[PDB]
Design a protein around this ligand. Structure first.
Ligand SMILES: N[C@@H](CC(=O)O)C(=O)O
Ligand SMILES: N[C@@H](CC(=O)O)C(=O)O
Ligand SMILES: N[C@@H](CC(=O)O)C(=O)O
Ligand SMILES: N[C@@H](CC(=O)O)C(=O)O
Lengths: 326, 326, 326, 326
């Protein structure tokens, strides 16, 4: 059987409350094999090895945990057959993409969480975990970049996003679709991401101990520019604008970002719209202002790419070429 | 024939570029009957009357235009049979909800825009406009609150949102669905919003010349609290948190908002997740901190309701009862 | 506590296999009590009464079980506070609509199934059943027609349909959306079906012992007319055509049905297309041929309505008025 | 400029009515040139060559047109740079997949239709055609199998399907998603179909003049077996069952097909359910009965594959291996 290493980071997947009727869910609530003893069926498809990296609610996820997982994975690659990462569902789409860009291991790396606390009836965690490990042990899962396995579906780290606040079927690659579907331990792959990932990226955080400073400003009617200004005065390396429609910005916010763009601040235009790309040929002329169009990357994902892009350049033209290849 | 008044506000619906191959679209590009002469078929279903209120790109939409439309509509109610409002698509979901809460006229009020410039081939504006006026002239459209008509569909002002950056089929009530579908001028209504609207709301901006100050902060991994702090120090009346998952906040942002909540700042928790409600029984205990759960209202909509709620109260418990009824 | 009556008819909701890894699922596998003892939390929200009407796999569902459930519910109405009906998921959409047209009880009537056998991990049956009982005990569920509760959602029997073959979140009302969402025992209703149902229908099967004969023919490229012909020669009261696109038919099938239309056979045009209405103003001129357009009803629901319409008429013009009101 | 060959077969893309208010749409209404002169911008992106293969409404599409298009494309391959095929939207999904299996040309082969007659306002034909030609002229479109371009989207012929009866954004690849999105003449490809197609299939209709006989029976509550029986007695090579749920059949239909399976009739199990795969490990045991599971292929696509599979075998075990690779 394959040697599957499980890197735990916390999340609902490893926590409940007190009863099925009601529960006091917070961030976590249990160690590692607890999340191995509960699903005794795993022992049938793999040799699982656990290790608690940290144990928080993804809502508090941050650069350090990211950098750690990245290094941890790069280091253990040769010693194991595939990795499974338990994680909260709130920022799972953010961590998955980061790892997708930094992991240099091409053996399966599957992320998995749970939308219901283990204490609830019909909790999805146990089946999600099973399937995740099944995917990880599957030879065919290799070379597809970081994956996310939820509700019998295999989703790529780039397009995946949480589309619903409570639904167990929340996760979907809203622009390009899933890569495969799972049935009784069997996976039918019919897709694989085109953009370069993992071992094929220039990014390598092996020696980094911290990442650039990137913030996200939001756009709406009568929007205030203070948040934008705040991040500027506070000296931030880059800023992702969650624009309205196709990457548009409210006057105020536009000016502030237009100026900061001069000062030498990396500005990427993304959109609050859940689906579709922020194209370069629209209302705004990024060429003149130095803005970068995020494409199909949403605000929180465009950030991930801006940080890494900044670890290697500050030229809007370069950063933009990056946003067109990863 | 019914007397349909058209209140123009600009938007792509009234603008193009230069050619079909390429165009220099900005915010607007044409007056009022231009948007009446182009679709000569209107004269067959109604007596259209135009009036340019303003002419901007919804990306710059703001409180004043809102307050104006509100007053304009309340005033003209008795003189016309229904209203049609041309508007940009970028913040259409924001203006529609505001009017839904303030218009005291129960005669049809339909909003409509266009995802393609009139200069492009297969431009959707002309058909959207037609259908909008058809809906407005339809007796059955009355008493359903403010509507939005795009791609042969009739959507309510509350649930409607832009789900795609370029698709002509972008607008969808993502939580509860459309109210009716249009076919050859005929509408099949099978739904009507349950929450109280228009004439049944306590809100009345007749005498207001400005609205409270509400800003939106965004949540992601390693989120910064500066934007939140900025809006606080700048003395804002309320703040809507675009949280992760079910209304959760990143540590930093949570503290800042938790404190400001004491100071007397109205804090509502919404989510960046495009679908689903931000419930009151989750991780965070709003009772202790004074936060209000937005429900199915997204960030930019929860703002609209916070502003109006503030024009009448600052008690979290009251504001919350409002978020459960409108 | 409410007195909720549970009428069981079988389905996966009441059956598994042998183990979590593998199971030998067929049609059923357990009585009534079992589906009450498994969820001991029910006792806290209601006074449940069981009764096994039948116990098959919905794939074998038929007119008799329908007539029975209808009669059973009508008779029991005054004795209980609400009904829950465990059912298979394959034809649940068909049964749900039938009851929606024939039940003359306006107290809560909720249908519920499960996509995963009770033997699997993360089975969805126990939570569905819970929620279905919460729904049936809720005063606000009355007068909304027959409901279907699956995956924390309350769907009407007319629009609901199975959109996926294996997904637990398979049931959706694809044209008009859900009526409400369930959350920690609480239901947020924001919709209600406009079409007349239950107590407001002319249909009453009290004295019927059998229903008319309606068959469904399918349309594709190079389609054969033999199935259509067979149902004709076999003397069928009506025929629903699962056409391509907007109710279109392949030449062959068209002639056969066009002819049988004269003979006195009730012909309804529906579509194989999952979403949208089959309209009257399209390619085909139903007026000349005597065809009836199904509207948003899919083939299997267009049948339910044709059968009941036939128990009261055979005039295309009247049958069509029926398809426009129910 | 690329030499793009346009093979026309009719459909709405080439027909209207009389006016914008009303039209008498039937099947077609115009030659080839017209669908080139209407869009004078084509001349700037390609050297278009036309040819009218046939001119019907896809509802009447059939094996002959298929065999012809296949042969026509194979023969012309070396003479041109890419093909565009104007087609009706009703059975476009069926034709698209057939070509996907039989075309041995790997240069761009794009299909395209229109949901609105050229006479209506905002007709979608002209922009679809434009984009289809852009797609066919794009070097990156090669080797992706037969494509379908609608509403600014590039869909593969295997997964594509008509999800709505009237919506211009009706075509979607419901299981695996689009391959790319078109934007201002530019295409962002991020996917490509994994299943073998065109030049990598064993199927070659070069010498065939007709295809096997496959029919589709439908499943619902109280279903009749007569249509199944009819296709049997009529001596049909194969039968696709549009089952309920995960390929399940109603008792009656089951026996009939179970028996015909022995007789030597190719029986494939598909589902009426719009999304998801019909799996082999479910209720029914295909191994014992000789049935073949369709996978994600819907009924009308399961037919296309069964016909071609039959041109090379009749062994259930082999036919099944075919459904698992194409
Ligand atoms: N608060 C939890 C939510 C979940 O995982 O379901 C988390 O983000 O880890
Ligand atoms: N920039 C335009 C976009 C559109 O209407 O299509 C607006 O928001 O008005
Ligand atoms: N074949 C079973 C499966 C299920 O219940 O989900 C039925 O339809 O009853
Ligand atoms: N009935 C026509 C309609 C269309 O083309 O869209 C066809 O399928 O060809």
């Amino acid at each position: 059987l394959p040697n599957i290493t499980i890197l735990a980071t916390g999340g609902t997947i490893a926590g409940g409350g007190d009863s099925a009727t009601k529960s006091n869910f917070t961030v976590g609530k249990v160690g590692v094999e607890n999340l191995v003893n509960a699903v005794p069926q795993l022992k049938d498809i793999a040799n699982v090895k656990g290790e608690q990296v940290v144990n928080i609610g993804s809502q508090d996820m941050n650069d350090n945990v990211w950098l750690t997982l990245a290094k941890k994975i790069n280091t253990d690659c040769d010693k194991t057959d595939g990795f499974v990462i338990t994680h909260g569902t709130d920022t799972m789409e953010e961590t998955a993409y980061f790892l997708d860009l930094t992991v240099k291991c091409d053996k399966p790396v599957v992320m998995v969480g749970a939308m219901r606390p283990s204490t609830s009836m019909s909790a999805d965690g146990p089946f999600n975990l099973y399937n995740a490990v099944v995917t990880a042990a599957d030879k065919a899962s290799a070379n597809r970049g970081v994956l996310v396995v939820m509700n019998d579906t295999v989703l790529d780290g780039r397009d995946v996003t949480k589309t619903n606040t409570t639904d167990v079927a929340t996760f979907k690659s809203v622009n390009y679709g899933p890569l495969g579907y799972i049935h009784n331990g069997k996976i039918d792959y019919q897709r694989t991401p085109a953009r370069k990932h993992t071992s094929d990226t220039p990014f390598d955080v092996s020696k980094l101990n911290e990442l650039p400073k990137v913030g996200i400003v939001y756009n709406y009617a009568n929007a205030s520019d203070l948040p934008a200004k705040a991040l500027v005065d506070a000296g931030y390396d880059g800023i992702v604008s969650a624009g309205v429609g196709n990457g548009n910005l409210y006057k105020s916010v536009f000016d502030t970002l237009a100026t900061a763009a001069k000062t030498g601040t990396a500005v990427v235009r993304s959109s609050r719209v859940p689906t579709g790309a922020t194209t370069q040929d629209a209302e705004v002329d990024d060429a003149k202002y130095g803005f970068v169009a995020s494409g199909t990357l949403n605000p929180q994902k465009a950030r991930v790419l801006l940080q890494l892009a900044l670890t290697q350049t500050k030229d809007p033209q370069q950063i933009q070429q990056i946003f067109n290849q990863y």
